[PDB]
Amino acid sequence: MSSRLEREAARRRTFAIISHPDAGKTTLTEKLLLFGGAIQMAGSVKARKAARHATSDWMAMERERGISVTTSVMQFPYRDRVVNLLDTPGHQDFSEDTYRVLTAVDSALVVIDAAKGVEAQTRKLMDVCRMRATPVMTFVNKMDREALHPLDVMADIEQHLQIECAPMTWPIGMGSSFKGTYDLLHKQLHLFSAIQSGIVIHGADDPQLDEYLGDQAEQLRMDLALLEEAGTPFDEERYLKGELTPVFFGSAINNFGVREMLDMFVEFAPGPQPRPAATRVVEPGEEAFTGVVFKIQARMAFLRICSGTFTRGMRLKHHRTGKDVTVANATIFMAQDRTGVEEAFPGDIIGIPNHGTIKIGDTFTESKEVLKFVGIPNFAPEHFRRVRLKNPLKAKQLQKGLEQLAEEGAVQLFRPLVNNDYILGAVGVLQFDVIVARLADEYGVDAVYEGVSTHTARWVYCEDKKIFADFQDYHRGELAVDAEGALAYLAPNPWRLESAMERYPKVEFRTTREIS
Numbered sequence: 001m002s003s004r005l006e007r008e009a010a011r012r013r014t015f016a017i018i019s020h021p022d023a024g025k026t027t028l029t030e031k032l033l034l035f036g037g038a039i040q041m042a043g044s045v046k047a048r049k050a051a052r053h054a055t056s057d058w059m060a061m062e063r064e065r066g067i068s069v070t071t072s073v074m075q076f077p078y079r080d081r082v083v084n085l086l087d088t089p090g091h092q093d094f095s096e097d098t099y100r101v102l103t104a105v106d107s108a109l110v111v112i113d114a115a116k117g118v119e120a121q122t123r124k125l126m127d128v129c130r131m132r133a134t135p136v137m138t139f140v141n142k143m144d145r146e147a148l149h150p151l152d153v154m155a156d157i158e159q160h161l162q163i164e165c166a167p168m169t170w171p172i173g174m175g176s177s178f179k180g181t182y183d184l185l186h187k188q189l190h191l192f193s194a195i196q197s198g199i200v201i202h203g204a205d206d207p208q209l210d211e212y213l214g215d216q217a218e219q220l221r222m223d224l225a226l227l228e229e230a231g232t233p234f235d236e237e238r239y240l241k242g243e244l245t246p247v248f249f250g251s252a253i254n255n256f257g258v259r260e261m262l263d264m265f266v267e268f269a270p271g272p273q274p275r276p277a278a279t280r281v282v283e284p285g286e287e288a289f290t291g292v293v294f295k296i297q298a299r300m301a302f303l304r305i306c307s308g309t310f311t312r313g314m315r316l317k318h319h320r321t322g323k324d325v326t327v328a329n330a331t332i333f334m335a336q337d338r339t340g341v342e343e344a345f346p347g348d349i350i351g352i353p354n355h356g357t358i359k360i361g362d363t364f365t366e367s368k369e370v371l372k373f374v375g376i377p378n379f380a381p382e383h384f385r386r387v388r389l390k391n392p393l394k395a396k397q398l399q400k401g402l403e404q405l406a407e408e409g410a411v412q413l414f415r416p417l418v419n420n421d422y423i424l425g426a427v428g429v430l431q432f433d434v435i436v437a438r439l440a441d442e443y444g445v446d447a448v449y450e451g452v453s454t455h456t457a458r459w460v461y462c463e464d465k466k467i468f469a470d471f472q473d474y475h476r477g478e479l480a481v482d483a484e485g486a487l488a489y490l491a492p493n494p495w496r497l498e499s500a501m502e503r504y505p506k507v508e509f510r511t512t513r514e515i516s
């Protein structure tokens with residue numbers, strides 16, 4: 001029946017966490033790792049957390065490359081599945097890279113702070129998942145602090161993440177009155193105390209509820225009947241379509257409620273899925289190795305394995321340059337206690353060292369066939385700046401530098417139609433600081449920034465050749481070309497954009513565009 005590869009490939013579970021800041025992603029991640037026996041990685045995740053708020057000597061330690069790479073892809077075994085959890089940079093580090101990580105996961109898990117509910121970064125990231133039709137599992141965290149009512153929390157999720165909510169575990173009480181969770185499908189009761197085997201409940205009439213929950217038993221029975229009416233039973237097919245999301249309540253800090261969520265994930269989360277290419281749809285089943293670059297770092301290119309098997313001694317062909325590339329000493333991301341020939345299977349991540357001459361989306365194969373993976377885009381930035389050059393004779397240099405950095409994708413570049421200025425857009429503002437320093441160290445250029453009216457950008461496309469031309473004349477003042485030669489409308493804010501948009505309903509204004 002199944003092949004060695006098709007099995008190995010299917011044990012994979014590749015996901016990232018989409019969360020707003022301070023929700024507990026780091027805490028939950030460390031918790032997940034401990035379940036996978038990933039003792040050391042878990043240490044690293046914890047050590048880094050600690051080092052942020054530590055003395056100066058550590059801040060200088062966490063900010064280094066060696067570590068932010070080890071924890072960038074964290075793999076651990078769980079219930080014989082190989083879970084590949086990809087770090088999604090947040091806080092100060094939030095950038096386009098975060099979105100790109102979402103272009104490499106078969107699925108995602110949402111983590112919500114119960115007190116805050118759905119916040120801005122949660123919505124933003126979910127926005128990405130929706131367009132790529134990526135199934136999501138939801139974990140409502142921090143039930144030990146006072147929080148929103150669970151029904152309120154679902155309502156919040158449903159409204160703002162535009163998806164149905166299927167609760168799997170329900171919380172009894174909250175804050176100081178947090179007793180634990182009742183797992184609806186398994187008819188088990190999990191008490192919070194200072195993991196543990198749960199208690200079987202037979203019917204909602206079980207006196208055990210009274211025994212363990214006391215006067216709070218009434219609320220669970222109260223809540224459960226409400227649920228069994230306006231309730232969405234987890235439906236596997238609907239989850240995969242993205243229409244529905246399983247919800248879990250817990251206290252990551254206390255390693256509570258996590259087990260159930262982890263189990264749901266290994267059992268039902270998607271394994272490596274087919275990937276589109278220009279010529280055809282690559283299947284993870286195929287023996288021939290294929291991979292797609294989704295992240296780059298200053299040089300190493302992280303690659304998601306799309307089909308086949310990766311080993312050190314193998315030879316890969318870089319299609320864009322047409323070159324032949326060596327992976328002799330790559331980075332294979334794998335759980336500690338390796339114990340096997342060193343190989344990677346579809347859904348895994350590998351770090352190919354390659355100097356320059358790469359882009360986001362580049363395809364590497366084993367065979368002599370032309371193949372080009374598609375669908376990893378650039379995302380419209382929220383933040384813009386105009387780059388000013390102090391010494392005008394260095395203009396040829398800045399131009400090289402910026403064009404090269406954008407090809408590499410450290411930032412997005414916009415050249416207005418009515419002037420010679422450079423406007424940089426960034427998914428997160430940190431990118432601007434990175435760009436300045438790199439421009440100096442790699443290109444010998446001191447560049448400054450200046451503020452601009454612009455807060456919004458959309459890529460414009462129109463079928464009616466006359467209308468599009470008329471439009472381009474009217475909004476000559478707001479148009480720009482990006483590094484990839486694409487036409488972009490720049491607006492001061494989303495509202496001002498609608499004025500333009502309602503005037504030209506026949507012009508499309510996209511928030512993404514494919515790379516070449």
Ligand SMILES: Nc1nc2c(ncn2[C@@H]2O[C@H](COP(=O)(O)OP(=O)(O)O)[C@@H](OP(=O)(O)OP(=O)(O)O)[C@H]2O)c(=O)[nH]1
Pocket residue numbers: 019020021022023024025026027028049141142143144145250251252253254
């Ligand atoms: N009560 C409660 N708190 C939780 C829970 N999970 C995480 N936290 C706390 O929330 C803060 C953010 O957690 P992170 O895990 O760093 O969140 P993030 O990665 O999403 O930014 C931390 O507090 P901090 O004070 O900023 O740092 P720390 O010194 O406490 O680690 C952490 O201890 C939870 O389940 N219950």
